[PDB]
Amino acid sequence: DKWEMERTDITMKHKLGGGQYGEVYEGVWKKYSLTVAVKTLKEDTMEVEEFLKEAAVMKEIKHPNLVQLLGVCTREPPFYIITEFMTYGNLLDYLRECNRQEVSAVVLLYMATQISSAMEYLEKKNFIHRDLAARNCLVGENHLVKVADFGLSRLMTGDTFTAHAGAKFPIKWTAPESLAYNKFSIKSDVWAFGVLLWEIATYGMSPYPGIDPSQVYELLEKDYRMERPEGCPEKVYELMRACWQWNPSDRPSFAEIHQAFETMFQESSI
Ligand SMILES: CC(C)[C@H](CO)Nc1nc(Nc2ccc(C(=O)O)c(Cl)c2)c2ncn(C(C)C)c2n1
């Protein structure tokens, strides 16, 4: 493909971190004097074909609020996925460490608007994220937020996919039908978006504070939901609650969610 790059085109600068399936490095694409992010493959955590398929999916993604693929190094090991660099790291650490006078209520609305826009695009393009959380959103200059998209899957909007036998999910972000039946759809991303709103509203607090993850399912089925965070506008909390409807079909679409946040963002600025 025209996405293939020479390994020598990039010079690594610094290791940013990395966890589950690979490390992230800050690098420089010398030919364009451009700072980039390089995703490596951690052997024994993820198979080569599963990693190459992630890159194939990213090739098709083009949105201002979705991390842009720049190139890939597949020919031989180690394999790399080269994307644009997001200067301030993940949204979780950013919210926890920020100056709340600078990152005010309007900036929070701005951030939710950008995320919902990326999700509306995935919904329109027949993609599912399956890992929406603040730690998977990246921040750039002037509160620019982009959703990381390594784990995207092709799924016709409305269809439900089933995860593999004995799959582990981050319980507190996972929709009840996904916890109980390993069923994932755009509606399960709507549920996770609800949790992401709560992380934004609390400036990076951990959801279901103090609650045992093994008791979350039973609580959700008995209609327990996180309460309205301090300072959260009731309209924004009504949206979280609409995202947390037990029935997937009762949850709003990302087009409706995006429209609601766009209106509130325009109004708050005015
Ligand atoms: C923990 C690592 C892996 C990080 C945060 O989630 N991932 C991570 N961090 C990024 N950039 C930064 C920016 C600043 C810092 C800093 O502290 O100075 C750090 Cl750690 C990373 C990044 N940019 C594009 N990507 C794509 C690959 C989407 C990134 N993934």
Q: How far, in Å, CA of 237 to CA of 157, rounded?
A: 25
Which residue, 69, 43, 37, 45, is CA-closest to 56? Answer: 69
The letter for the amino acid at 212 is: D
DSSP string, 191-250: HHHHHHHHHHHTTSPPSSTT--GGGHHHHHHTT--PPPPTT--HHHHHHHHHHT-SSGGG
Which residue, 46, 65, 188, 155, is CA-closest to 118? Answer: 65
Return the CATH class of domain 1-85: alpha beta
Q: How far, in Å, CA of 143 to CA of 75, rounded?
A: 36
Would strands 69-73 and 80-84 be described as parallel, antiparallel, or unpaired?
Answer: antiparallel
Q: By the 8 A CB rule, do 13 and 29 touch?
A: no
Q: Which residues are 139's β-sheet partners? A: 145
Would strands 145-147 and 161-162 be described as parallel, antiparallel, or unpaired?
Answer: unpaired
Which residue, 182, 196, 175, 184, is CA-closest to 244? Answer: 175
Q: Find the helix or strand (DSSP H, E) in which 57 lies.
A: helix 48-58
Which residue's C-alpha comes closest to atom 6 of ligand 1? 90
44 tagged catalytic: no
Residue 261 burial by CB count (10 A; 0-12/13-18/19+): exposed, middle or buried?
buried
Q: Residue 23 CA: which ligand 1 atom is closest?
A: 3
Domain range annotation of the chain:
1-85, 86-270
Q: How far, in Å, CA of 227 to CA of 170, rounded?
A: 20
**To 5 degrees, how large is the angle CA 15–CA 19–CA 24?**
30
85 is in an annotated binding site: yes
Resolution (A): 2.5
Q: Residue 37 CA: which ligand 1 atom is closest?
A: 24
Q: By the 8 A CB rule, do 188 and 159 touch?
A: no
Output the CA torsion 137→51→21→159 (10° steps).
60
- Does any ligand 1 atom lie closer than 6 A to the CB of residue 83? yes
90 is in an annotated binding site: yes
Q: How far, in Å, CA of 191 to CA of 246, rounded?
A: 9
The active-site residue, picked from 1, 131, 159, 212, is: 131
Phi, psi of 105 (to 5 degrees): -50, -40
Q: Pick from 85, 86, 146 the residue to mutate for probing ligand 1's pocket: most ligand atoms within 8 Å of its CB.
A: 86
Q: Domain 86-270 classified CATH 1.10.510.10?
A: yes
19 is in an annotated binding site: yes
Q: By the 8 A CB rule, do 97 and 42 touch?
A: no
Q: Which residues are 34's β-sheet partners? A: 29
Q: How far, in Å, CA of 29 to CA of 12, rounded?
A: 9
Which residue, 50, 249, 71, 231, is CA-closest to 153? Answer: 50
Classified as helix, coil or strand, 123 is: helix
Q: How far, in Å, CA of 15 to CA of 27, rounded?
A: 9
Which residue's C-alpha comes closest to atom 28 of ligand 1? 148
Return the structure tokens found at 171.
Answer: 């319980």
Which residue's C-alpha comes closest to atom 30 of ligand 1? 24
Half-sphere exposure of 241 (CA within 13 A, CB side): 13
DSSP state of 4: B
Hey, do 1-85 and 86-270 end up sharing a CATH topology, with the first three levels equal?
Answer: no
Residue 264 alpha carbon to ligand 1 centre in Å: 29
Residue 68 alpha carbon to ligand 1 centre in Å: 14
Q: Which residues are 83's β-sheet partners? A: 37, 69
Q: Residue 18 CA: which ligand 1 atom is closest?
A: 3
- For the beta sheet containing 34-40, the strands, ordered from the edge strand earlier in sequence to the opposite edge, are 10-18, 23-29, 34-40, 80-84, 69-73
b/e map 114-123, b = 16+ CB within 10 Å: bbbbbbbbbb
Which residue, 132, 148, 139, is CA-closest to 91? Answer: 139
Q: How far, in Å, CA of 204 to CA of 92, rounded?
A: 5
- Does any ligand 1 atom lie closer than 6 A to the CB of residue 133? no
